[PDB]
């Protein structure tokens, strides 16, 4: 695998970087008991990730960031997808793309954050918030913490805040908190709030003169907005915004599942 593609030196170096990062985070927690450091890249990664996910938003040394950034940049740029190589599915300005949002070269990706705004603090959890934070680096959690400290309160639903993307190929991450759905059918208030997430993100991207923005599937997963309904709100809000403002923004709907992928194509077909 690695030999023909010349990957072996980088694998051995990335493993050494993970062990350094793991050791530093364990020392900080006063986990002084000597753990069995796994041999594999995969098992090292899941150990590192769990430790990063749970770490409170406390200062980090420049030495730690040097190692973390070398490792994260190498991993995120290995199989990068550039927006310039994709083609619009609608007009010249709307794309649908199945893939990992943390590997897309684009001005901004949109994070489905929570109101505490530090990322996902559940070890090794499969949500978008966790994945974005983990691949981007600890600097995102620290920047988020500073945003919350300066505003004196948790983040409300339907807003947008921008941070740098750090180790991601994305220049920026736009963080929005989507509505939590408990009861069905979805209230008009909650439908309006999900729309507001998209609008807020679009407005902020145009406010900063960005050329492109990729959305994930906001309020799906644990917030558990019904899928078909969310897709419909996403598409309708985007197309309305682009039409009414004559924005030059290019908008990517990032999906992972084939179910979502079909939902998005169907929504963009129906007029
Ligand atoms: Zn999570």
Ligand 1 center to residue 127 CA distance, Å?
5
Ligand 1 center to residue 152 CA distance, Å?
24
Ligand 1 center to residue 114 CA distance, Å?
9
Q: Give me the CATH code for the 82-269 domain, please.
A: 3.40.220.10
Alpha carbon of 50 to those of 75, 114, 123, 126, 249: distances in Å?
A: 17, 18, 4, 11, 36
Ligand 1 center to residue 125 CA distance, Å?
5
Strand locations in 12-133, DSSP E? 81-82, 94-98, 104-105, 108-112
Q: Which long-range contacts (CB under 8 A, 24 or more apart) does 126-132 make?
A: 127/221, 127/222, 128/101, 128/216, 128/217, 128/221, 130/53, 131/100, 131/101, 131/102, 132/101, 132/102, 132/168, 132/173
Ligand 1 center to residue 91 CA distance, Å?
34
Ligand 1 center to residue 251 CA distance, Å?
25
Ligand 1 center to residue 184 CA distance, Å?
23
Sorted by where each begins, the domain ranges of the chain are 8-76, 82-269
Least Cα distance to 2 among 41, 37, 38, 39 occurs for: 41
The answer to whether 111 touches 216, Cβ cutoff 8 Å, is yes
d(CA 18, CA 50): 12
Give helix then strand counts, H and E, for the chain: 8, 8
Ligand 1 center to residue 73 CA distance, Å?
22
d(CA 142, CA 118): 8
Q: At what angle do helices 128-136 and 41-54 cross, to 10 degrees?
A: 100
Q: How was this structure determined?
A: X-ray
């Amino acid at each position: 695998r690695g030999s023909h593609m010349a990957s072996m030196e980088t694998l051995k170096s990335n493993k050494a970087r993970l062990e350094y990062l793991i050791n530093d985070m364990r020392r900080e927690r006063n986990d002084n008991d000597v753990l069995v450091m796994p041999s594999s890249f995969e098992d090292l990664w899941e150990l590192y990730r769990g430790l990063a996910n749970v770490r409170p938003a406390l200062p980090v040394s420049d030495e730690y960031l040097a190692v973390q950034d070398a490792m994260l940049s190498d991993l995120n740029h290995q199989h990068v997808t550039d927006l310039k190589d994709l083609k619009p599915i609608k007009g010249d300005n709307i794309f649908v793309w199945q893939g990992d949002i943390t590997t897309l070269k684009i001005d901004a990706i949109v994070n489905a954050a929570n109101s505490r705004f530090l990322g996902c603090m559940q070890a090794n959890h499969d949500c978008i918030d966790n994945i974005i934070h983990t691949k981007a680096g600890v600097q995102v959690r620290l920047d988020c913490a500073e945003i919350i400290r300066q505003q004196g309160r948790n983040e409300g639903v339907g807003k947008a805040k921008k941070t740098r993307g750090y180790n991601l190929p994305a220049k920026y991450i736009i963080h929005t908190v989507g509505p939590q759905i408990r009861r069905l059918p979805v209230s008009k208030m909650n439908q309006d709030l999900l729309a507001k997430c998209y609008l807020s993100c679009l407005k902020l991207a145009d406010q900063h003169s960005l050329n492109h923005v990729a959305f994930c599937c906001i309020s799906t997963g644990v917030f558990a907005f019904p899928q078909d309904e969310a897709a419909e709100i996403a598409v309708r809000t985007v197309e309305s915004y682009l039409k009414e403002t004559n924005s030059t923004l290019k908008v990517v709907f990032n999906v992972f599942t084939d179910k979502d992928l079909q939902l998005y194509k169907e929504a963009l077909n129906r007029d």
